[PDB]
Amino acid sequence: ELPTLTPGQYSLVFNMFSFTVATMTASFVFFVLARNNVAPKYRISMMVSALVVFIAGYHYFRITSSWEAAYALQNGMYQPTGELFNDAYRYVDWLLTVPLLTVELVLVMGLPKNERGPLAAKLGFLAALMIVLGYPGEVSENAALFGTRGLWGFLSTIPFVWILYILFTQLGDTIQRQSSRVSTLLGNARLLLLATWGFYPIAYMIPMPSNTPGTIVALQVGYTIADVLAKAGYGVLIYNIAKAKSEEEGFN
Ligand SMILES: CC1=C(/C=C/C(C)=C/C=C/C(C)=C/C=C/C=C(C)/C=C/C=C(C)/C=C/C=C(C)/C=C/[C@H](O)C(C)(C)O[C@@H]2O[C@@H](COC(=O)CCCCCCCCCCCC(C)C)[C@@H](O)[C@H](O)[C@H]2O)C(C)(C)CCC1=O
Ligand SMILES: *C/C=C(C)/C=C/C=C(C)/C=C/C1=C(C)CCCC1(C)C
């Protein structure tokens, strides 16, 4: 039973969702169109990045719709309509997009081709498992650290740190081995991943006021900003990495 909202709280969220649907659609066309601005060996990362924002565009379209159908303007206030606001769309969006986000980065990393598929496979499945393990905790009724939410948050953190560990301490021989420009861009993408991905378990723990206007607005706005940055913003960095590499490899 979502709380009644002021026009300002309702509109801030609604426009934020609408902006994200527009931004993901633009990113999809940009990444699709960008396919041909990079060498052939990197067009796969661009198709993966286009898939990521297409899937997020679609889910945010569902999210925007659900938000609107869940409220009605009555006397200068947005009152719950009885229709449920579905939070699952974002969770399903994470399950499908997080593995691809890791594969994208692996493909522009500059690893020898005998190391590329194994790393994409390991990181992609660790990311999927991280989301799977978070599931029981997110649908949990009790937000206790010493309870269901803390248990699954802990289990899910395992594959998460495992991924972070690999990106920050198991690849050095590769990033450092790149030109300054590329090494820099790659370092920035890894850092953007840490910062944006880091937001999610932090928001997960905050509960550890359930449904007051201020808490739903803050959470929806925070998750939406993080999703935009972790997928569209991050995709732009992946694109500039593929581009710079393509130019170095004297490609036209
Ligand atoms: C869930 C749960 C649990 C688990 C909890 C867990 C796992 C919690 C985990 C928390 C985590 C992982 C938190 C992580 C936090 C990470 C943070 C705060 C990272 C901050 C990073 C910062 C401030 C980075 C600054 C980087 C800078 C100034 C870089 C400068 C570059 O060298 C420059 C030269 C400027 O790069 C240029 O800009 C580039 C542009 O890209 C960039 O500038 C890259 C952007 C990267 C910056 C990211 C900052 C985002 C803000 C942080 C938000 C905080 C949120 C986490 C709340 C290129 O355009 C140019 O080509 C390049 O030359 C338990 C407790 C275990 C159990 C219970 C339970 O349930
Ligand atoms: C576009 C969506 C992205 C980048 C989503 C990333 C989500 C995570 C890194 C989620 C992590 C979680 C944990 C590390 C533990 C607690 C439960 C989760 C699923 C919120």
Side-chain angles (χ1 to χ4, degrees), residues 142-151 153-154 201-208:
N142 179 55
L145 187 258
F146 297 96
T148 308
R149 205 184 174 78
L151 164 62
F154 166 77
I202 286 173
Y204 180 87
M205 291 190 300
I206 298 300
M208 291 178 257

Side-chain angles (χ1 to χ4, degrees), residues 39-62:
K41 56 161 87 173
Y42 306 110
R43 294 182 173 165
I44 175 61
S45 60
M46 295 297 84
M47 298 176 114
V48 173
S49 185
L51 180 56
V52 165
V53 298
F54 181 85
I55 293 177
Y58 171 75
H59 282 136
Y60 266 88
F61 164 72
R62 292 294 182 181

